[PDB]
Amino acid sequence: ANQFNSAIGKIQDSLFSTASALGKLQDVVNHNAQALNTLVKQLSSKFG
């Protein structure tokens, strides 16, 4: 029980300090926002 409690306490630090993962959800959000922004920005192109 003590070992599990220590690990679950360290969880709140290992999730936001060591980084590694948790960047994939941010990657999804960034990719969708960037695609939408590019789609809007394509309206300013002359295309010849």
Binding site: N37, V40, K41, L43, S44
Partner: protein, 48 residues
């Protein structure tokens, strides 16, 4: 009110509201990061 506005040759359709943006004196209009027009200076009363 949603109107078709023509400000000094810049033509569009939208609703106009009073702005807290502070244009530089030479600036006539402004646009977003995606280059969509967002604020227009009125050439008569110099209001944004």
């Amino acid at each position: 009110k949603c109107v078709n506005f023509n400000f000094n040759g810049l033509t569009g359709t939208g609703v106009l509201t009073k702005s807290n943006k502070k244009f530089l004196p030479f600036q006539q209009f402004g646009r977003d990061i995606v280059d969509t027009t967002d604020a227009v200076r009125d050439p008569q009363t110099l209001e944004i």
